Amino acid sequence: MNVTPLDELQWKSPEWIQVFGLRTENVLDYFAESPFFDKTSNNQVIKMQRQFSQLNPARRQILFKYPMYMQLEEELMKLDGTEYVLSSVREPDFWVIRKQRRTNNSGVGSAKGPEIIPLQDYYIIGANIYQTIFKIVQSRLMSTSYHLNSTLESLYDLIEFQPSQGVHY
Amino acid sequence: MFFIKDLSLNITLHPSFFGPRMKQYLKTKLLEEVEGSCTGKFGYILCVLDYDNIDIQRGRILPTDGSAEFNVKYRAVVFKPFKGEVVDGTVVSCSQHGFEVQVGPMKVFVTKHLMPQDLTFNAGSNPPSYQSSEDVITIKSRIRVKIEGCISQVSSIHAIGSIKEDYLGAI
Amino acid sequence: AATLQLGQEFQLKQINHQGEEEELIALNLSEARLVIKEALVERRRAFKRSQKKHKADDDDFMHSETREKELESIDVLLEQTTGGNNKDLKNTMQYLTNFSRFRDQETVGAVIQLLKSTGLHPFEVAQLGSLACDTADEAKTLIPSLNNKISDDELERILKELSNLETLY
Amino acid sequence: GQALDAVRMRLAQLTHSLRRIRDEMSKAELPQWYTLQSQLNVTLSQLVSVTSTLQHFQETLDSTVVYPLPKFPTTSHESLVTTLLRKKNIPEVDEWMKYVRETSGEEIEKLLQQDREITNWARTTFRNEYGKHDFK
Amino acid sequence: PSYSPTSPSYSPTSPSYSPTSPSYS
Amino acid sequence: KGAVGPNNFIWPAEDALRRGMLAMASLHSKEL
Fold first, then answer.
1. Could you say which residues from 72 to 91 on chain A have a Cβ atom under 8 Å away from some Cβ of chain D?
2. What domains appear along chain B, each with residue ranges and CATH number?
3. Backbone angles phi, psi at A156, to 5 degrees
4. What is the CATH number of the domain that holds C123?
5. Which residues of D touch C104 (CB under 8 A)?
6. Which chains, if any, share at least 3 CB pairs under 8 A with chain F?
7. Which UniProt keywords apply (chain B)?
């Protein structure tokens, strides 16, 4: 069953931006309803935990700028696994998240902190979301080769040979 | 080594060539005398650029014989090495004392004292060559020679080079 | 020129007939061979034009199928342009043809761009265009000027790229 | 970065050769056939080298992660960013291999091994045929 | 040096083929 | 520009067409 690749997949939510608008405060809230947000990530678990509790270079800059991002670490350091964190922000139109997974290897002999490993690239441009360059290059080259093949077969069709002259047109 | 230089020459034209076509005779004389020559001040004269743009000067009839002397300036590509130069070349002849390598239009000789002892002379091979653990050097084998000295005469320049240090021999 | 001792006659700064300082020009086997071939064919064309004045085929010479056909065209060019009185020119041209690293003008331009993008000395650039070295240290030892002036990683990258650029015969 | 640098220089020379063949085809008069063959073969073998080198360094290209510059402004250059970002094939090639697969259309595996044995048999047969007659 | 740089071969007129489909909520 | 005001655009709104009854009419085209 034909599936559109998620790298080119682009979601638009006019109702959400009309109701709430685009801001770093609710950029994760905007991302929550997208298909790219896995329901198995610990961010959703933290979200239900918060809901239950209520019912009952630029990395350091964005680190020190917002306190909710602080709360994100102090709620995310306890849970290791696939997590969604912000990468960088330039207002009022550009935001990009950092898709990384954490394995808090607390074993004896490792003086490093929890291991952070990239998984995917996500770019929020306007109200749209974008998600390999190797594929782009090979696709461009193969389409170029197809066009070249068509041109060369047409040119060879145009070619006419005679023994007494050689090849002419 | 190939370089572009500005050269001048004094050419004497015989009185019997004194006609409206003197420029053609001067051009023929220049091309026939200069190209392929060797001068110790500038090395071998390989080629002359911009043949249509030959610069000329007014004649000055010599008071003794009547031949008109002209001063001609041009730009030329020439070849000349320097002390300590390393050049790739082709083996010409093999001998017990060493070998001879043609580089460009010149010959650089290396004496057996100027290579490491690992290269041993093999005379039974056809052709006789120098054989080592890794590098084998013979006719038509690209060999790098570090030129150490050059001797300049009127018509040619000979060179003597050494390969005594590492990273020398067959490539 | 182990210590770049080029003397007065071959200074880096050259005074031309116009009186303006110019950078010293150094050409490897490929560049010099292409330049001399172009000059010879231009002179032959001028001679033919002059003969037509007093009283098509030239496209096949520059484009050579093989080394032997190129050598035959070279012999014909020397017969029709030089007169056969210059053996040293024939020997130099044969040495250029047999050990020309690069036959196509575009590839020679690529080699020139790769070697002189770093801004090295023209002597070193011409030597690198003439010599094909497997390892950076081999070139550095065989070119004492390149020592202390180029990083080993850059030299290795340049040498590998040049080896890849060599057109198969 | 070294692998992507080599890819850059080789693709740049390939694009230069493409520009060449372009501005010698754009002339109103077609040059001799032989020059066209030489240009075709050179550019096409250069494309082969491009493919081979891109094959060699897949790991370095894959390891790299794309990210826009902090200094690069997206508000004014969003069109330029989207131009390079998009990667979907041209449609005509798409329905091209769709019709190709339509025409082509344990069983598949044993046909695959049957193709293996036919290939090996044909190779051996032509080796024998070449050995039968002295070609030197 | 560099014999000649490459001519700008930008094609902004290219319409692109981005698939758009997950717009409905 | 940043405030999306309803029912006043130069061009027809995509959200207007999404909220328009033509969307469900196409969805309920079988019922037609």
1. 87-88, 90
2. 1-84 (3.30.1490.120), 85-171 (2.40.50.140)
3. -65, -35
4. 1.20.1250.40
5. 42
6. A, E
7. Cytoplasm, DNA-directed RNA polymerase, Nucleus, Transcription
